[PDB]
Design a protein around this ligand. Structure first.
Ligand SMILES: Nc1ncnc2c1ncn2[C@@H]1O[C@H](COP(=O)(O)OP(=O)(O)O)[C@@H](O)[C@H]1O
Length: 124
């Protein structure tokens, strides 16, 4: 009974660290957030901003989504993020990732009422 909005928080929000992500952050976070249960999710981004700040992006700059839908929004301000990208030698269930911290604008897709983030589209 996890909502799409709740899933976005689980998969992409990490407001509890002001970004200080160790080289093992993704290995730990990808498993702790259940993104390596059925397999190793290839790529996934975590956002280190407050929940309110990320939810606010749904009212920010409307930009085309990678899938062609019109429900994507880019943050006006840059945000603290961590990208997780499965290593070339990662072998499920031993999911291995490279951790890369950055400060970039995020692009999320929003749906529902309230209109909230449900998908992480890209960082730019
Ligand atoms: N424009 C969009 N592009 C991609 N997915 C979208 C879009 N708008 C809504 N969604 C929904 O967002 C959800 C994304 O879920 P999931 O694949 O688990 O996480 P993520 O895409 O954030 O890694 C799906 O229910 C999908 O249909």
């Amino acid at each position: 009974k996890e909502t799409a909005a709740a899933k976005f928080e689980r998969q992409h929000m990490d407001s509890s660290t002001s970004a200080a992500s160790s080289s093992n952050y993704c290995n730990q976070m990808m498993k702790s957030r259940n993104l390596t249960k059925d397999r190793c999710k290839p790529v996934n981004t975590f956002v280190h901003e407050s929940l309110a700040d990320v939810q606010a992006v749904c009212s920010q700059k409307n930009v085309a989504c990678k899938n062609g839908q019109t429900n994507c929004y880019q943050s006006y301000s840059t945000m603290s993020i961590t990208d997780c990208r499965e290593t070339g030698s990662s072998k499920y269930p031993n999911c291995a990732y490279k951790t890369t911290q950055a400060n970039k604008h995020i692009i999320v897709a929003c749906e529902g009422n309230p209109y909230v983030p449900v998908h992480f589209d890209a960082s730019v």
